[PDB]
Amino acid sequence: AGCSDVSTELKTPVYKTKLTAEEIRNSAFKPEFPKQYASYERNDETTVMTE
């Protein structure tokens, strides 16, 4: 069902955005990283308290 061995390296995925070297506007990262952005937005929650 599958046949080559795992890698000891632990290679982090590599990316190549469409963004310019000096891009700083948060909402420019949105269309290319929707899942992280979605998560980033969860910081907007401001009602939950711990001990």
């Binding site: 599958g2 046949c3 061995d5 795992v6 000891t8 632990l10 290679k11 982090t12 995925p13």
Partner: protein
């Protein structure tokens, strides 16, 4: 003549089954699912790297092993396709049990004179890192998906 062909098919059949049985026990087969990488890596890095996953994760007995392999196998395919796995992958009761039994299987002689079985429920409650190096920092075990 004719039955010699039959015999020749017989040996092939069992040889193939046996090979497949063994192959479906080892690290390269198990890690053909990206979800099993953390456990693959930690295994290859550990003292137990040169034994198979099912040397710990399946019963050693031939009769008990065949069904266990097909049940866990079936259940794992299902989880990787139609089901929705969580943020935490934890060994269920049953697998904690077949593993600890296999601890006993290979390290009996070290423990013959000592009630190490009665102290903690499982060996790994002391030998903590045999459980896939759980204590080591996240970055030594895991990355994001591609």
């Amino acid at each position: 003549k004719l039955v010699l062909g039959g015999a020749t098919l017989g040996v092939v059949a069992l040889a193939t089954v046996a090979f497949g049985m063994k192959y479906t026990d080892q690290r390269p087969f198990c890690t053909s699912c990206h979800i099993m990488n953390p456990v693959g890596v930690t295994h290859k890095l550990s003292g137990h790297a040169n034994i198979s996953c099912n040397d710990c994760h399946a019963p050693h007995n031939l009769l008990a092993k065949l069904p266990f392999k097909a049940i866990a196998g079936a259940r794992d395919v299902y989880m990787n396709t139609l089901g929705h796995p969580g943020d935490l992958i934890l060994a269920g009761m049953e697998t904690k049990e077949v593993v600890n039994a296999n601890c006993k299987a290979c390290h009996t002689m070290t423990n013959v004179e000592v009630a190490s079985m009665e102290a903690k429920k499982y060996c790994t409650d002391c030998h903590r890192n045999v459980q896939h190096m759980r204590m080591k920092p996240i970055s030594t075990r895991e990355v994001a998906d591609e």
